[PDB]
Each structure stands twice: as structure tokens, then as C-alpha cells.
Design an enzyme around this catalytic site. Sequence first.
Site, PDB file in Angstrom:
ATOM      1  N   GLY A  44      28.539   4.203 -36.634  1.00  0.00           N
ATOM      2  CA  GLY A  44      28.546   3.721 -35.263  1.00  0.00           C
ATOM      3  C   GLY A  44      29.060   2.314 -35.156  1.00  0.00           C
ATOM      4  O   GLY A  44      29.372   1.666 -36.167  1.00  0.00           O
ATOM      5  N   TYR A  48      27.771  -5.852 -31.375  1.00  0.00           N
ATOM      6  CA  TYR A  48      27.367  -6.795 -32.410  1.00  0.00           C
ATOM      7  C   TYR A  48      27.739  -6.400 -33.857  1.00  0.00           C
ATOM      8  O   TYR A  48      27.915  -7.299 -34.679  1.00  0.00           O
ATOM      9  CB  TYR A  48      25.858  -7.086 -32.274  1.00  0.00           C
ATOM     10  CG  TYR A  48      25.529  -7.758 -30.952  1.00  0.00           C
ATOM     11  CD1 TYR A  48      25.697  -9.130 -30.784  1.00  0.00           C
ATOM     12  CD2 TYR A  48      25.139  -7.010 -29.843  1.00  0.00           C
ATOM     13  CE1 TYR A  48      25.433  -9.751 -29.563  1.00  0.00           C
ATOM     14  CE2 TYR A  48      24.912  -7.615 -28.604  1.00  0.00           C
ATOM     15  CZ  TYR A  48      25.048  -8.988 -28.473  1.00  0.00           C
ATOM     16  OH  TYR A  48      24.800  -9.602 -27.265  1.00  0.00           O
ATOM     17  N   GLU A  50      29.385  -3.049 -36.848  1.00  0.00           N
ATOM     18  CA  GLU A  50      29.894  -1.717 -37.151  1.00  0.00           C
ATOM     19  C   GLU A  50      28.984  -1.260 -38.292  1.00  0.00           C
ATOM     20  O   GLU A  50      28.665  -2.067 -39.164  1.00  0.00           O
ATOM     21  CB  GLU A  50      31.360  -1.767 -37.578  1.00  0.00           C
ATOM     22  CG  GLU A  50      32.079  -0.438 -37.426  1.00  0.00           C
ATOM     23  CD  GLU A  50      33.587  -0.532 -37.276  1.00  0.00           C
ATOM     24  OE1 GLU A  50      34.211  -1.365 -37.970  1.00  0.00           O
ATOM     25  OE2 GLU A  50      34.151   0.253 -36.479  1.00  0.00           O
ATOM     26  N   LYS A  66      25.854  -2.813 -42.444  1.00  0.00           N
ATOM     27  CA  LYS A  66      26.075  -3.305 -41.093  1.00  0.00           C
ATOM     28  C   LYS A  66      26.983  -4.517 -41.211  1.00  0.00           C
ATOM     29  O   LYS A  66      26.588  -5.557 -41.745  1.00  0.00           O
ATOM     30  CB  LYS A  66      24.699  -3.638 -40.482  1.00  0.00           C
ATOM     31  CG  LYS A  66      24.690  -4.323 -39.136  1.00  0.00           C
ATOM     32  CD  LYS A  66      23.284  -4.878 -38.848  1.00  0.00           C
ATOM     33  CE  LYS A  66      23.068  -5.241 -37.415  1.00  0.00           C
ATOM     34  NZ  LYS A  66      21.611  -5.389 -37.157  1.00  0.00           N
ATOM     35  N   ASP A 154      13.247  -5.517 -29.525  1.00  0.00           N
ATOM     36  CA  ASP A 154      14.158  -4.409 -29.234  1.00  0.00           C
ATOM     37  C   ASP A 154      13.536  -3.107 -29.665  1.00  0.00           C
ATOM     38  O   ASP A 154      14.198  -2.234 -30.236  1.00  0.00           O
ATOM     39  CB  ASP A 154      15.541  -4.627 -29.852  1.00  0.00           C
ATOM     40  CG  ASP A 154      16.654  -3.805 -29.246  1.00  0.00           C
ATOM     41  OD1 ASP A 154      16.470  -3.284 -28.120  1.00  0.00           O
ATOM     42  OD2 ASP A 154      17.707  -3.692 -29.898  1.00  0.00           O
TER      43      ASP A 154
HETATM   44  N1  ATP Z   1      18.929   2.302 -42.525  1.00  0.00           N
HETATM   45  C1  ATP Z   1      19.571   3.297 -41.891  1.00  0.00           C
HETATM   46  N2  ATP Z   1      19.578   4.529 -42.465  1.00  0.00           N
HETATM   47  C2  ATP Z   1      20.281   5.506 -41.876  1.00  0.00           C
HETATM   48  N3  ATP Z   1      20.993   5.459 -40.744  1.00  0.00           N
HETATM   49  C3  ATP Z   1      20.934   4.241 -40.177  1.00  0.00           C
HETATM   50  C4  ATP Z   1      20.277   3.130 -40.677  1.00  0.00           C
HETATM   51  N4  ATP Z   1      20.456   2.037 -39.841  1.00  0.00           N
HETATM   52  C5  ATP Z   1      21.200   2.507 -38.869  1.00  0.00           C
HETATM   53  N5  ATP Z   1      21.514   3.834 -38.999  1.00  0.00           N
HETATM   54  C6  ATP Z   1      22.286   4.674 -38.084  1.00  0.00           C
HETATM   55  O1  ATP Z   1      23.580   4.137 -37.934  1.00  0.00           O
HETATM   56  C7  ATP Z   1      24.141   4.652 -36.705  1.00  0.00           C
HETATM   57  C8  ATP Z   1      24.944   3.579 -36.020  1.00  0.00           C
HETATM   58  O2  ATP Z   1      24.074   2.475 -35.701  1.00  0.00           O
HETATM   59  P1  ATP Z   1      23.961   1.948 -34.197  1.00  0.00           P
HETATM   60  O3  ATP Z   1      22.942   0.880 -34.062  1.00  0.00           O
HETATM   61  O4  ATP Z   1      25.347   1.470 -33.748  1.00  0.00           O
HETATM   62  O5  ATP Z   1      23.592   3.223 -33.312  1.00  0.00           O
HETATM   63  P2  ATP Z   1      22.465   3.552 -32.236  1.00  0.00           P
HETATM   64  O6  ATP Z   1      21.112   3.300 -32.793  1.00  0.00           O
HETATM   65  O7  ATP Z   1      22.675   4.987 -31.747  1.00  0.00           O
HETATM   66  O8  ATP Z   1      22.770   2.520 -31.063  1.00  0.00           O
HETATM   67  P3  ATP Z   1      22.029   2.016 -29.745  1.00  0.00           P
HETATM   68  O9  ATP Z   1      21.220   0.755 -30.127  1.00  0.00           O
HETATM   69  O10 ATP Z   1      23.093   1.709 -28.682  1.00  0.00           O
HETATM   70  O11 ATP Z   1      21.095   3.127 -29.310  1.00  0.00           O
HETATM   71  C9  ATP Z   1      22.983   5.261 -35.909  1.00  0.00           C
HETATM   72  O12 ATP Z   1      23.105   6.679 -35.936  1.00  0.00           O
HETATM   73  C10 ATP Z   1      21.742   4.770 -36.663  1.00  0.00           C
HETATM   74  O13 ATP Z   1      20.658   5.690 -36.603  1.00  0.00           O
END
Ligand code: ATP
Length: 327
Positions: A44, A48, A50, A66, A154
Site C-alpha cells: 500500500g 506519508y 509506501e 515502510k 490513530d
Molecule cells: N507489520 C505488518 N504486517 C503485515 N502487514 C502490514 C504490517 N504493517 C502494515 N501492513 C499492511 O500494509 C498494507 C499497506 O499499509 P497502509 O497503512 O498503507 O494501509 P491501510 O492500513 O489499509 O491504510 P489506512 O490507514 O488508509 O486505512 C495494509 O494492508 C496493512 O495492513
Amino acid sequence: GPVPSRARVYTDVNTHRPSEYWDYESHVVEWGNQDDYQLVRKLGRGKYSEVFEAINITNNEKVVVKILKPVAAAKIKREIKILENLRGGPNIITLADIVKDPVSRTPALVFEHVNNTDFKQLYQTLTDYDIRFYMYEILKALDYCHSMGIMHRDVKPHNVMIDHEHRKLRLIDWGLAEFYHPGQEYNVRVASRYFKGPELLVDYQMYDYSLDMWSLGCMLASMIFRKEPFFHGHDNYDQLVRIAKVLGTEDLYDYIDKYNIELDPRFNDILGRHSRKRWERFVHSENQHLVSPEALDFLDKLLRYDHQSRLTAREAMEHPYFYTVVK
Ligand SMILES: Nc1ncnc2c1ncn2[C@@H]1O[C@H](COP(=O)(O)OP(=O)(O)OP(=O)(O)O)[C@@H](O)[C@H]1O
Ligand SMILES: N#CCc1n[nH]c2cc(Cl)c(Br)cc12
């Protein structure tokens, strides 16, 4: 002007720690080796960062990387320091490494990978027992970070990951988290719309850990009532109106009277006059399996206008709603 406020718990945890604990700008980042991580797929992107799934080739374990965008790279020491301060805590995501990305030339945070259950699947399938079990798990994370002098700011479903097979929960995305210092005025542009506390919506800056308890209440209400989101505002102003249609306008006006708040005059034509609705108003055939008198009482004690009146995370853990949860 506005009347000051301070937290009722963990008020001076930061004053009693060495300055290095909360003076995040003075922190010297320890950099790892970017070559240890092989990017696999993009998960995703936000305004802020990728996010990528990757493999740590030194142990062949999955991780999540991240990569900070040039905009969000400025407050990176705050997120780093908070993650390092909380590392090893109950249900806190583990920061595995910090590396300089060769392409963006920005910091890249490497995290523990969670094989998380789909969030819509969680919303649709978690049973009454599961909601209590997982609410107890998120409370352990919140009480830990609050006791460590940090507010998450958050809390929302997408930041509370669950790997349902291993009954494992992790609180993620610490990019908006901040150190709590009594008397500090904070930015109200935090949390996501549906999870913003009334303090943010009325522009009251001297808030505390209790913001996270409102956001948790919003998650609980959505889960038990089968209403996503529970308070469905069209924008930040309508968000307060949605809340006022449930909690009533009288308690809202008493809250802004107590704190001597100057309410935005744009609210005069849209708030209206509403009484509080009893929680049974939201019960129906399709959610009754998730509702109990203990769930309603617990929810009632989270979703309060006055941030000082809400249960703390440790008080929440004492509530009868959790008596059935195996400990
Ligand atoms: N430690 C982690 N283990 C597995 N997946 C993760 C981890 N941290 C983040 N992700 C995943 O990475 C993806 C992209 O992160 P991102 O924060 O952009 O998405 P999101 O949570 O759907 O966003 P939003 O805050 O707009 O709801 C998401 O599907 C999130 O669940
Ligand atoms: N809404 C939603 C699904 C969902 N995502 N994350 C969660 C965390 C807890 Cl503690 C609980 Br209960 C539910 C969820």
C-alpha cells in the site's frame, strides 16, 4: 481562554525519565543494512509512506518495510523513538530495523510481519467472545503505551491487526503517536475522521491518552452494533453532529462550558437540539448476538464527551465485560 486539563493517570511519567527518553530530536539513529531486505510486493501507499512486504535474507523471515515519503521523513525520529521505547511491550508491533532506502534516499522502517486476518472478515466474523478477547488484548497495548507516556492518536480497525489463527493482536502505525507532557497543546489534526474524539472536533488542544479511549469506544460500538462506522460524519463538523445525535447536545454544551471552549460558530446552524439516546435504540435482530448489558455499560463509559470522565485503559480492563475472557 480555555481552562487547562491534564490526564488523571500517568501524568508525569515523562518528567521522571532521562530527557533522552522523550527528546526524540536529540536521538542518534542506529542504521542497519538495506541489503538484508529484499522487497517482494507493494502492500500500500498513503500520503506519508509506501509499505512493502519483504524478506529478511539473513533468516528468510517475512518483514514489512515502510519507506517514508520526503514529506513525512521530517518527524521520523519521533516515530523511531516511540517504537524503540515501546519495543517488547504487550501487543506492540516490533521495529526490527531502520535502513536508508537506496531509491528514495529516505528512512525505511522494518517491522515484524503479521499474517493478519482480512479486516472485513474480522468485522463480519468475530463472535461476542472474540470481541471481548481482542478488546482485552488492545487494552493491554494501550495501557502499556499510556504507562510509557505515549498517546497513539490513530486508533482505528486498520491499525489494530489481528492474526486470528494464532489469536495474536498488534497495534501498528505509530506515525501519529506523541509523548504526553502535562499542559502541552497538541495538534487536533490527528486520528481518522470517524475515530476523532470530541476534544479534537471542538478544537481543544490540551488533550491526553483519553483520546485513544474514545477511538476504542468507536471501534467497540461499530463491532457490537454492526454499524460501520458508528459515527458516520460527512466531514469534521458533521462528525460532531453525528455524535450529538447519540449523546445529546446538553452534555456537549456542558463539556464546552466546563473547559471554557469557544465553539466554532459554524456549529450554530447544524448541531440542533438532541437528547441522549439509550443504547438499546441501536440494538436489532442482526446485532443482538453481540450485545449484552455489560457491553453497553462498558461502551457507555468510553463514549463520553468529557475526556477526563472516560475509563482509562487499566480501569477498562477491570470491567465486567471481560469477566468471561480466559486469563
Ligand atoms: N507489520 C505488518 N504486517 C503485515 N502487514 C502490514 C504490517 N504493517 C502494515 N501492513 C499492511 O500494509 C498494507 C499497506 O499499509 P497502509 O497503512 O498503507 O494501509 P491501510 O492500513 O489499509 O491504510 P489506512 O490507514 O488508509 O486505512 C495494509 O494492508 C496493512 O495492513
Ligand atoms: N472493526 C473491525 C474489525 C477489526 N479490525 N481490527 C480489530 C481489532 C479489534 Cl480489538 C476488534 Br474487536 C475488531 C477489529
